[PDB]
Ligand binder design. Structure first.
Ligand SMILES: C[C@@]1(c2ccccc2)NC(=O)NC1=O
Ligand SMILES: C[C@@]1(c2ccccc2)NC(=O)NC1=O
Lengths: 300, 237
């Protein structure tokens, strides 16, 4: 079990750790989060009490280093940093734990909600989508645009998701125009899976990372990416059977976790109705269709 | 974006553009089978591709053999249209290729966009105008070449005959759309108007009769009357 200590909490802020959130008051004696499960990526995120604008946060994996949070009063935000002095870090954490100045990552011992949302998400791949190679953790916020959004403006601060565009020469083989537009299997299987992602695990990892960015920071571009990756599968007549079964599980847990009150804006009516009721895979997502119909029947 | 009444004179500027109408590509007769079920029999069709500034009509005849063994023909027809328009563009010298292609039906937008991905600078546009190009097969010489075709064939016409020697392309297009609107609303009446007088003939190399300027004014008035009529006969006004 790993720990992310905080130097202090000088400004009132709502802090989230994965799917959990808690409030910290201005100058409250808060010194971080302990008992963080090893084996998963994690995200620690922030919304200031005085400017709910800009949710921001950091993706990290405690196996990759000792990380802490420190507020910067010049840049006005809580920053993640790496402590290279391992003995200094262990000493700091032990003192904060002895003084019980940390919230404990919940230890609910029955379901894998976070595992189920991050099954295919790897820190190495996050770091290729979010480029800042001198850090082992990755910063994301509400406003960051994607490389595709920038083609339609600061490249260093962009989300480099894989570009998916159904009306692109990459997606459409000369002479197979109708075939490739109406059945995207070529684009899914040859271009994207064999060619770019190499395997379905990496495809699902980016899909899951895009959803989490769309939900935790209200990142419009991440939302677009998540839906495009769903639609590319649902619009392919030929999809490996294990991929469909896994996609159904992935989406089920995503829909289950979504805040009920953010559904109106986080769920694209057109894509979901097409995917569940018109697409080649309309009958292949039983778990997802059942939770969607019972939880958001308005959208459909 | 979309073409409508406000941006109408754009049709007659000097940017090359083509209208594409797909309404006569896939044509059928519906009939009863011996068992009393219903079946269709395809007949030859055509793509109607028109330069509104010059009158140049690229009539691609769609022979019924292109449907043999194919499913979902109404969907296929839109993609075949887009394939043939793309092929026409590629066949033209660069300086004759259109800068815009305006489709008369919005269901042609995605098929044509996809077939024209190689031409990112050609704009594919819909229109809000209700244009009467479906009535092209009421022009006798066009219907004749379509029904006589035994294989795929492109035939070139000037749909304005020699009118541009005397009138502007705005006026010529307005005359064409009035004639076609009339033929679409009451083909028999419209054709009676156009041919009642046997001394006005259609030149061998023309589609419409050789009316004088004065006779066109009379003809044009008779077509307006017809359209207004039928609009009463229809709605009882
Ligand atoms: C246990 C915790 C929480 C648990 C479940 C949902 C939301 C928050 N409470 C708290 O102060 N911090 C947390 O993580
Ligand atoms: C509504 C919103 C959105 C954000 C993330 C996913 C879907 C919608 N659109 C936008 O411009 N900012 C948002 O929060």
């Amino acid at each position: 079990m790993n720990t992310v200590p905080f130097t202090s909490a000088p400004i009132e802020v709502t802090i989230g750790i994965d799917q959990y959130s808690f409030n910290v008051k201005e100058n409250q004696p808060f010194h971080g989060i302990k008992d963080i499960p090893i084996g998963h990526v994690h995200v620690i995120h922030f919304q200031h009490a005085d400017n709910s604008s800009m949710r921001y946060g950091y993706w990290f994996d405690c196996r990759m280093g000792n990380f802490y949070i420190q507020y910067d009063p010049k840049d006005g935000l809580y920053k993640m940093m790496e402590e290279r002095d391992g003995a200094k870090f262990e000493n700091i954490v032990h003192n904060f734990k002895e003084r019980q100045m940390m919230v404990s990552y919940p230890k609910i011992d029955e379901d894998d909600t976070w595992y189920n949302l991050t099954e295919f998400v790897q820190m190495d791949k996050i770091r290729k989508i979010v480029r800042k190679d001198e850090n082992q953790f990755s910063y994301v916020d509400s406003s960051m645009t994607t490389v595709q959004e920038n083609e339609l403006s600061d490249p260093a601060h962009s989300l480099n998701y894989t570009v998916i565009n159904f009306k692109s020469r990459e997606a459409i083989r000369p002479g197979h125009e109708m075939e490739d537009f109406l059945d995207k299997s070529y684009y899914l299987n040859t271009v994207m899976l064999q060619g770019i992602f190499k395997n379905s695990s990496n495809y699902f990892g980016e899909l899951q990372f895009a959803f989490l960015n769309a939900m935790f920071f209200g990142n419009y571009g991440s939302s677009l990416q998540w839906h495009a990756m769903i639609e590319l599968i649902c619009s392919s007549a030929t999809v490996p059977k294990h991929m469909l079964d896994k996609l159904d599980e992935i989406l089920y847990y995503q829909i289950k976790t979504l805040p009920e009150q953010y559904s109106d804006i986080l769920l694209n009516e057109r894509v979901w109705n097409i995917c569940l009721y018109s697409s080649f895979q309309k009958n292949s997502l039983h778990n997802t269709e059942k939770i969607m119909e019972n939880k958001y029947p308005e959208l459909l | 974006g979309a073409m409508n009444s406000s941006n109408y004179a754009e049709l007659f500027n000097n940017d090359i553009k083509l209208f594409v109408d797909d309404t006569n590509v896939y044509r059928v007769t519906v009939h009863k089978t011996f068992e009393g079920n219903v079946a269709t029999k395809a007949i030859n069709g055509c793509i109607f591709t028109l330069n509104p500034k010059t009158g140049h009509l690229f009539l691609k005849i769609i022979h019924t053999s292109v449907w043999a063994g194919q499913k979902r023909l109404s969907q296929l027809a839109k993609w075949k249209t887009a394939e043939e328009v793309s092929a026409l563009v590629r066949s033209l010298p660069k300086e004759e290729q259109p800068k815009q292609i305006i489709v008369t039906r919005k269901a042609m937008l995605d098929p044509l966009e996809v077939h024209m991905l190689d031409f990112p600078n050609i704009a594919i546009r819909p229109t809000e105008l209700r244009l009467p190009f479906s009535a092209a097969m009421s022009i006798d010489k066009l219907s004749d070449v379509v029904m006589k075709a035994t294989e795929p064939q492109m035939v070139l016409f000037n749909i304005y005959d020699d009118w541009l020697d005397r009138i502007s392309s705005y006026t010529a297009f307005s005359r064409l759309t009035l004639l076609l609107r009339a033929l679409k609303t009451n083909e028999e009446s419209a054709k009676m108007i156009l041919l009642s007088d046997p001394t006005i003939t259609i030149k061998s190399y023309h589609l419409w009769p050789s009316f004088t300027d004065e006779q066109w004014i009379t003809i044009e008035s008779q077509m307006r009357d017809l359209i207004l009529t039928e609009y009463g006969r229809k709605y009882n006004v």
